[PDB]
Amino acid sequence: APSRKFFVGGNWKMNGRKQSLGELIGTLNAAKVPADTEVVCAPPTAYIDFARQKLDPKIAVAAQNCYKVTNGAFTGEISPGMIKDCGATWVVLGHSERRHVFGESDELIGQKVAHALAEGLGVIACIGEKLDEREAGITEKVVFEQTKVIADNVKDWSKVVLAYEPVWAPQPAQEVHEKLRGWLKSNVSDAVAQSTRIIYGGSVTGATCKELASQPDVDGFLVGGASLKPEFVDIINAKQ
Amino acid sequence: SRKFFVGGNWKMNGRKQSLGELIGTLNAAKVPADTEVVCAPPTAYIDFARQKLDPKIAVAAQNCYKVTNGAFTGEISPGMIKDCGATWVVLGHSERRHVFGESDELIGQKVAHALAEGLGVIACIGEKLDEREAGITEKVVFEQTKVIADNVKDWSKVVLAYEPVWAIGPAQEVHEKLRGWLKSNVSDAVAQSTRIIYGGSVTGATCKELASQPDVDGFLVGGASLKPEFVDIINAKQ
Ligand SMILES: [Br-]
Ligand SMILES: [Br-]
Ligand SMILES: [Ca+2]
């Protein structure tokens, strides 16, 4: 049915311990996820290896962040090389919490994108405007600036997914996704615009997934709180 | 007297194969009596390292955040660290302060949370070259220490690490001043019992002389912690 393969990422954020995450993983393994959804789970960094060992190999594992060189004097960071060594195949970059709580600049995010892709990871590249920005009427400026930094660091979009986070919060998600796809068409290529998944972040739940997934430019979801809950399986099945 | 303390900060280095080999060499080494050894692996390898290291060596995380769970993509909490079997966290490392912009206020909040959650804390302080050359080392490190101390109720599980950021090639002079700070601003008892470890460059060839200084209680070792000479550093008092 869709033009781009449906993509569902679950961002566990800074939540869970071995016991509770083991239970979450058991539930996902028992769901037998459909072949037509690409599912990725992003555990806290201390649990990437633990989670990859237990999770169904059909579900991919992402790190929630990484740094921009293979090794070095960066206490508290991890590199793409470590992510791959733990069996993870994706990284989430530019998440709103890294930008707005931890002050990660666009320049730094672009450098991380380039390094992660060179190292062979997939990247879930996050963008989004804050409340003050939406109220000031500059949604497009903000998300187009963020997207261009990402694009300037992407040579091959096959392993990139763009995630729009409505940090400020007919469907408003659809309006933004259509504009982002138009940006890709005009500034990268029609082929990249037509093939790149643009997934919706923020507060996706079992109650909103079917309506949002029916929007023509919404290709999936980056799921926060609901990724810890049984309803994540219903989100995976939003197109079934 | 104060138990000699040797921490190895692996920073953002190593993979399972190379860290497994490093751990084998540490497991085979004889750790002297009255010496507390701690290794701080990259965050992706805290659990791995704890599983492979002999219990004689403790594991530290290289950083943590200031609440137990929450919407902090990319962070880990003290509860997760303890769940992986680690018993320490390094907080305030110069790279966190200067590359990643962590404020004194944030570091203090992390210290309080990690202690409340049952971890030991290696709390790092230190001046940059421009501060050393301006003559303000003491002012800088005293203020950093004050923010830490305002967040420490019980010093039993705290170790203070002095890292002159520029010392990549004195220590005793600063350690003596920091101990005097503890004496005047906390208590004589805390000053006498708290380990103050040196986190500037330490190698096998410099460790014995540093360890003999009266106010140096051990080391937070950087690059040498990845190398065989870390075992010589563990033996710096022998
Ligand atoms: Br999220
Ligand atoms: Br260090
Ligand atoms: Ca001494």
Residue numbers in the entry:
A (entry chain A): 1 to 169, 178 to 248
B (entry chain B): 3 to 171, 180 to 248
Task: Reproduce, without paraphrasing, sentences from the article in which this PDB structure was first reported.
Triosephosphate isomerase (TPI) deficiency (TPI Df) is an untreatable glycolytic enzymopathy that results in hemolytic anemia, progressive muscular impairment and irreversible brain damage. Access to the catalytic site is restricted by the catalytic lid which is formed by loop 6.
The first is within the catalytic lid, which we found to be disordered within the TPIQ181P structure. We observed this in both subunits of the dimer; however, the affected regions were not identical, with residues 170-177 being disordered in subunit A, whereas residues 172-179 were disordered in subunit B. The electron density was clearer for the P181 residue in subunit A (inset), and thus we use this subunit in our figures and description unless otherwise noted. Residues 177-181 are observed in a helical conformation in both the open and closed orientation of the catalytic lid, demonstrating that the defect observed is not merely altering the equilibrium between the open and closed states, but is instead grossly affecting the C-terminal hinge and catalytic lid. We crystallized TPIQ181P in the presence of bromide, which we have shown previously to localize in the active site along with a phosphate abstracted from solution. Further, we found that residues E165 and S96 adopted the open conformation.
